[PDB]
Amino acid sequence: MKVQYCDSLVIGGGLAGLRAAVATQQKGLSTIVLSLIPVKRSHSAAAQGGMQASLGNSKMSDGDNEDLHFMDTVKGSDWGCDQKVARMFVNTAPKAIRELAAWGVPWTRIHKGDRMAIINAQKTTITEEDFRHGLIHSRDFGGTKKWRTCYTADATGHTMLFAVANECLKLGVSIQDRKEAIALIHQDGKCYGAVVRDLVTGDIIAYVAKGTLIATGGYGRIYKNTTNAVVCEGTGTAIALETGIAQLGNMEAVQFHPTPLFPSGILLTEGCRGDGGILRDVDGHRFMPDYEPEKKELASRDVVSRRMIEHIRKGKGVQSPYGQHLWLDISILGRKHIETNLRDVQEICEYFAGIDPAEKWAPVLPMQHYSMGGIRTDYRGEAKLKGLFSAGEAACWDMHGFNRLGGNSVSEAVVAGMIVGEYFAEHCANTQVDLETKTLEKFVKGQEAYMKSLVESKGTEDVFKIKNRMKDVMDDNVGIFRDGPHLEKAVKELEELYKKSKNVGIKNKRLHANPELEEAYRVPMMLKVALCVAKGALDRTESRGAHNREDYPKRDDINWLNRTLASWPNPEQTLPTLEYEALDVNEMEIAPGYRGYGAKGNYIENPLSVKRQEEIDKIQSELEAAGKDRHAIQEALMPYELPAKYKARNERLGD
Template sequence: MKVIYTDVLVIGAGLAGLRMAVGAKARGHDSIILSLVPPKRSHSKAAQGGMQASLANVIKGVGDNEDVHFGDTVRGSDWGCDQEVARMFVNTAPKAVRELAAWGVPWSRITPGDRQVIINGEKVTITEREAAAGLIGQRDFGGTKKWRTCFVSDGTGHAMLNSAAERAIAHDIPVHERVEAIALIHDGQRCYGAVVRDLITGELIGYVARATAIATGGAGKLFRVSTNAQICEGTGHAIALETGVAKLGNMEAVQFHPTGIFPAGILVTEGCRGDGGLLRDVDGHRFMPDVEPEKKELASRDVVSRRMEERIAQGKGVKSRFGEHLWLDITLLGENHIKHNLREVYE
């Protein structure tokens, strides 16, 4: 068996894996990234809506800070998250967004002056400050008190992944693509790398490393309908669990995206609801204000998902040969907004 040695072995070439390898290389450690697919085809590319960071740039985000973001995150998890991790996340997010800007991510920016937005189904005029001209823009998302979602039109993941992949190339980090890690090498206490299968030749290769990181993404393909790519089937979870040493935590905390196209599972960004889209039942009735009078369509994802399922269970779903579904109405946003801010949804 061929054996390859490195300081850091990163399994997965999405945003997490690329960023981890770049960070390790910047600190003087040789890194190798393994990937089922070419990095720019990783599932991170599918993200449309944006990335939250408490920059407080837009007028609707004024007063936002890491503590407010932390509170929203903990409440959104029903107090089930690891609060140390949440605190680390909210404190690091503003730095990460600015770092990505320096790497070339073309974040949508603020144009000062009046602009029309849809809030609670009605057109509202808000005025952006002159002082904020050119700063990173932010949109509204579910479960937040302030507008803090930084975005690149509706292709945020696409822009972020391209920039991170180019950064890895700039750092001369090798990506071994079309390979699959099938087992971890360990002695019952410490991990020393992975046994990897070449998906083209079938050859088994041993990768030996001082540190091994698993960044293989989610496991959405375990479910009947998912916005996840075909490769998101939990193989990273599996090889860790099969060691008999590693533990999987918070496995009940599967995040369901409320608005996938049924039954294909193609993602319709949360930006549709963040920008003012409305959920309607078979009668065309907007039902979210009835059950979530405060946040309505912009309640957290788990709440919106549950309320939608409840509506279908009440016999108010739209029947089709594939099963029942609901409508997401974005017509009130207008043609110009849809074609410019929600291009992928429009297409």
């Protein structure tokens, strides 16, 4: 039997996994990072919008602080997030940016002077004073009043990922790519590592550790149309689920992006509409103003996606052999503007769409983009299965609730990497494990037998036909608009698809470097993940954040002010088990209310919310009258925890 030991095992080489690895390795814990691909090719590398952090450096960032970032996050989540976690996040984001700057990330900097900027409420001139010169800049992104999105020109995710990966190399972290975790090793409610398949040699290896962290990204590829890399299939999510102990949170909470290139799904940055991009229908008609007279093109991304689908359903979509879509017209911004401020988007439409944006319109359609759902953890990042931690998009630390803020996800990956990294390091250093070879052998032999059965299967089902049908079902029934009737149909078909995935037969019999065998074990995993999404969507009878039920259009703060928890305790069951974790309004710094975007009074108020709100207004007034600072007031409203190393306050321009 092959066994590899390390004090800290990290599964996933994206921003979250790599940053967590730095945290453990820097304190002498031997750590290994497993990854399907070279770590610098992780999906994190595709982020071009930026990272949200309340630095307050630039003119449009002036006055920004943790409180403002906190409120944008909570309201954006439509109150589905754990507010204490959101607080840990916003207070740490500034230091994540600064640490990365020290690590060489080439953040775009502010230069003194005036600049022609688009405010879309007063596209005037912005002035940056001399004392702001040379500091980290920020741009308009995510719809926040305060511009706090930091960026490195047009490749933020790329430069951030490379810096953290390079730090891992500096520290001697063991990076092992083309290695896939296919099962978690656990006993007595504790996680001791993972069974890993070497994608090149086909060897099945047991990686044991005092602590295991899953940072495998999102599960967007269960959909046909997604902005995600082809490796975002949620297998990390599935292996946690298949332990029968760890739970997944809000899997039905999936966010879509309104303007990805159709049908590829290649992203066309938000800056397009932010600059002046125009959405047009089959007749070339600018339709957003018809639905949103005020906001128009610049409405909340959440609203734009809905309007786009509505417009298509009204029969105004463009017919295509790949389906219906709409148009994105950016030519109107002028060739000059495009080649100087959107040179990146121009290259995309040419290299893939084969069109010059300064002349022709780009086909677009809303597609799956971010996974708020994931492995459920406490504020420390630990799952119900002891010793198993999770961070990044793969988790449901839940700072996002039912709607993640644009720019908060790459921010979370690094921040969680830092915070969960500390708690994870502490766990690995202080915990003591009992590694029984009997158990290791059972898991390793079990997977070797599984691989053999797949290769020997005489089943007649085709894995690709099954995977492709799953993706259509998800797109057709679990998208922007959902209803009970269609969701019930989706669940039944997914369950049938799952049963058939067990009768798959493959042509190539080899155990090594076999992409067909890889699909044979990944697809069944994706189906169980899809089932958690679809079933969670069917059972959640309300509309909240990105989850829109046409048959239940209102946000129900009375019956659904909670979090969906999915599990799969019995390996024989064909449907996930769903339970609910109620959100305690008493522990909320901000009581439920109007989220800011969308129709007003579209939520069923909870009497407890009103009570708490009054309680909050009272505490504020009293302390505020007593001449107390925002920090002391915050503590009085909702105290939260932070590792000692990150307890410090964030110095800002002007203190």
